[PDB]
Design a protein around this nucleic acid. Structure first.
Ligand SMILES: [K+]
Ligand SMILES: [K+]
Ligand SMILES: [Mg+2]
Ligand SMILES: [Mg+2]
Ligand SMILES: [Mg+2]
Lengths: 129, 150, 187, 202, 68, 82
RNA sequence: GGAGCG
């Protein structure tokens, strides 16, 4: 059955990006997916995405711009304190200069660089670069 | 897919985006609920009450007219059956297979399907007990199942 | 008796504009024979002006929730009579609704789903486009950070709403704080 | 009334059955097909065929040295059009069979390094199309409804089977290339006769 | 149609027409009601005005039905 | 790329495919760079053109034809060509 | 020169 809607959303985008598609549909939608996209959008990894209301769960169409190398979830959602963020980046990211790990913290869903600035820990959702 | 087979069918109803009743539907909510109670007293179940309303009264969705589902309306009038409709039909099927199986001891196909039906009864009965739609001590008994249904 | 057409919450004193709306409401009750019977029970509980554009105003009249269903039956006719009295203005009726804040962490207190902020904002949007019925919604998340919602209206009621799309967008932003643009799907 | 340059070419292409496609349509050619008739034959949208001819001509005129352009056909019906196309546009025609290694083997006598490659049918000219993908050589090709679009940069949707269709297509393309050079006067007319491009059986 | 020659948000009205009712951008039923006394197009009940079948109910030639 | 001072530290900047935005490497011999000439009011080549680069990946997929058609349908409307 | 990690 559908276990992680976030994994389906990110896996669909990653496959679409590699095939060179301009758009891609994500179904179902969730507020976790929307907040994950916003983090990617702010760093200029996706374009404009649009939420369609269908009275059940909604759907999202995401515009791709060819800048996204990979995006995936980390399952299970391990706990990550501020002191352990460095180890996770050394594992999941291409280098110490680009790529973001998305965390869900009590202050909201954010990338690992913002988490260090606010000095807040949480759980890993996924990553992209 | 299916719980107890390899089927992967997707056929189902598709509710429209418009939750409000059509402009050509003039019946009011009090009138609809009067008919729902009228049919329940005749023995009809929530599933076959909605079918009559859709096919003979133009009421596509009762919730659009009354704001509540059919079962909720019946409960408010003390007409909800003690055993939920879906659980009732599973028990009736299990009774039918057992009655057939007593005269056909070599029908191993039926014996296989009886196991699936009864395991489906126990999974649904467990859920209804957790939600308190069945008596806490309610238990399905093959010996006395035929007295409940029919 | 013109103050019997207004019931402001907490028995507050109507402002200089509410009395005008209430006074205008009383006149239609007796002057217009067609609206004589219906308007007897109806009464309001607030009214305000909102600037739209080009020195244009919109009269947003709030209504008791219990009466929200009675105004609809006389919404199309009543707005025509009030707009002529309030020349160069658009009349909009929105039933009053409470927005209970979410309970704190580990609180047993429950909150009906209708009192949620999202449920109220959606309900306001439906009362804002009367008689037009919403047939679809889109929310576009722009790269800059802002988001804008697009609402599709049934083209059947296009003559009674095509000229109000600017008032709907302006009125909704003040009551919700969200950008909205209305459109009619091709048919 | 007077017919524009596009209406005249489309009128000429209709007479040559340039719009008649195959009974099968490749999924990357559906965008050019207009409609399918009960016979099962697809009808190519001649409006888009004319537009792709203009785009192809713009690419051809941008080539400073026409000798860098190579136009070839494998089937006999197009062996006459390519020779005449190269005669007026100054290109280098290769009619007949393509020798493997022409674009890759630097030591064989027939070695060439074209800047552009024009073909009559991707299905029959699969060898030069496959070999052009080893030397950064863009390719223009006339593509029917059931033509593979692999390694085809500009595909002109047309009937590349009939003898009249092949001749007319190269006649129009040659005129467009010259008109864009200023060598001949604008308009749908040309002093050269189209019949010089049709296949002359023994 | 190729993926990049189509817009997922504004598909042609003819394309969504032939898609499965559950696979459209917004789910929509293919059924409807009609006058003759409303009758469901896929009625499972015998009204003899309509005869239920595996799909749309078989209507009678005699009476004329108006969609609504 | 750029040192902390500002000096460039790359041998070269590879081209990006005009359709997929992929980098074109030095051994991608299936990639092609195309030029579309510009015309004047009369319709004669004016020495100006727009350049398009395609990677071997998209050309091998057979999507170069449709990609070029879309990229030209937009560009020509911007530079006045038609 | 083409094909194959060989
Ligand atoms: K079914
Ligand atoms: K050898
Ligand atoms: Mg399934
Ligand atoms: Mg199982
Ligand atoms: Mg060798």
């Amino acid at each position: 059955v559908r276990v992680s809607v976030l994994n389906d959303a990110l896996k669909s985008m990653y496959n679409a990006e590699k095939a060179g598609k301009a758009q891609v549909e994500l179904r179902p939608s969730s507020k976790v997916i929307i907040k994950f996209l916003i983090v990617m959008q702010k760093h200029g990894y996706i374009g404009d995405f649009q939420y369609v209301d269908d009275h059940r769960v909604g759907k999202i169409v995401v515009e791709l711009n060819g800048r996204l190398n990979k995006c995936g979830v980390i399952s299970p959602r391990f706990d990550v304190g501020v002191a352990t963020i460095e180890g996770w980046t050394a594992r999941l990211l291409p280098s110490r200069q680009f790529g973001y790990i998305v965390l869900t913290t009590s202050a909201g869903i954010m990338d690992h660089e913002e988490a260090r600035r606010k000095n807040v820990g949480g759980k890993v959702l996924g990553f992209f670069y | 897919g299916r719980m107890h087979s390899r089927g992967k069918g997707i056929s189902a109803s598709a509710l429209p985006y418009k939750r409000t009743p059509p402009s050509w539907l003039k019946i009011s909510a009090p009138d609809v609920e009067d008919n729902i109670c009228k049919f329940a007293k005749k023995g009809l179940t929530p599933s076959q009450i909605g079918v009559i309303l859709r096919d003979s009264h133009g009421i596509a969705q009762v919730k659009s007219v009354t704001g509540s589902k059919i079962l909720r309306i019946l409960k408010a009038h003390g007409l909800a059956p003690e055993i939920p409709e879906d659980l009732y039909h599973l028990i009736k099927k299990a009774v039918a297979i057992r009655k057939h199986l007593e005269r056909n001891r070599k029908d191993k196909d039926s014996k296989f399907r009886l196991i699936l039906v009864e395991s489906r009864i126990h999974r649904l009965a467990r859920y209804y007990k957790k939600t308190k739609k069945l008596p806490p001590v309610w238990k399905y008994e093959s010996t006395t199942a035929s007295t409940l249904v029919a | 008796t013109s103050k019997q057409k207004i019931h402001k919450d907490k028995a507050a004193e109507p402002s200089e504009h509410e009395v005008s709306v209430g006074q205008a409401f009383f006149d239609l009750e007796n002057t217009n024979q067609e609206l004589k019977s219906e308007l007897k029970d109806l009464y309001i509980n607030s009214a305000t002006q909102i600037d739209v554009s080009g020195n244009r105003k919109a009269v947003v009249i709030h209504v008791p929730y219990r009466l929200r269903k009675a105004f609809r039956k006389v919404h199309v006719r009543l707005v025509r009579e009030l707009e002529k009295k309030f020349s160069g203005k658009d009349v909009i009726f929105i039933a009053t609704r409470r927005i209970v804040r979410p309970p704190k962490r580990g609180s047993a207190a429950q909150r009906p789903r209708t009192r949620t902020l999202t449920s109220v904002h959606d309900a306001i949007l439906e009362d804002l486009v009367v008689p037009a019925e919403i047939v679809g919604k889109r929310t576009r998340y722009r790269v800059d950070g802002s988001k804008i919602m697009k609402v599709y209206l049934d083209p059947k009621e296009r003559n009674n709403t095509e000229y109000k799309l600017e008032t709907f967008s302006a009125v909704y932003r003040k009551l919700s704080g969200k950008d909205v643009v209305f459109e009619y799907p091709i048919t | 009334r007077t017919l524009s340059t596009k209406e005249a070419d489309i009128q000429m292409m209709l007479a040559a059955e340039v719009h008649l496609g195959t009974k099968n349509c490749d999924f990357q050619m559906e965008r050019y097909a207009f409609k399918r008739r009960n016979d099962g034959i697809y009808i190519i949208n001649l409006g888009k065929t004319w537009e792709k001819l203009q785009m192809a001509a713009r690419v051809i005129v941008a080539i400073e040295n026409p000798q860098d352009i190579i136009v070839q056909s494998a089937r006999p019906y197009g062996q006459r059009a390519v020779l005449k196309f190269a005669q007026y546009t100054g290109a280098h025609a290769i009619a007949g069979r393509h020798t493997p290694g022409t674009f890759t083997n630097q030591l064989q006598t027939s070695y060439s390094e074209p800047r552009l490659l024009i073909l009559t049918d991707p299905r029959t000219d699969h060898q030069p199309i496959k070999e052009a993908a080893l030397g950064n050589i863009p390719t223009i090709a006339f593509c029917d409804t059931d033509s593979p679009m692999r390694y085809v940069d500009i595909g002109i949707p047309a009937n590349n089977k009939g003898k009249h269709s092949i001749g007319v297509l190269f006649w129009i393309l040659a005129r467009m290339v010259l008109q864009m050079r200023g060598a001949i006067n604008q308009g749908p007319k040309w002093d050269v006769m189209v019949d010089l491009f049709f296949y002359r059986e023994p | 149609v190729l993926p990049n020659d189509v817009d997922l948000l504004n598909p042609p009205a003819e394309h969504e027409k032939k898609k499965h009712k559950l696979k459209r951008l917004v789910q929509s039923p293919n059924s409807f009601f009609m006058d003759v006394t409303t009758v469901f197009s896929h009625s499972q009940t015998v009204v003899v005005l309509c005869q239920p079948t595996g799909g749309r109910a078989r209507l009678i030639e005699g009476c004329s039905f108006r969609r609504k | 790329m750029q040192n902390d001072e500002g000096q460039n530290m790359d041998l070269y900047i590879p081209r990006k495919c005009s359709a997929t935005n992929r980098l074109i490497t030095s051994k991608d011999h299936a990639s092609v760079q195309l030029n579309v000439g510009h015309l004047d009011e009369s319709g004669v080549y004016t020495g100006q053109f727009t350049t398009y680069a395609l990677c071997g990946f998209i050309r091998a997929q057979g999507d170069a034809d449709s990609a070029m058609d879309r990229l030209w349908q937009k560009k020509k409307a911007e530079v006045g060509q038609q």
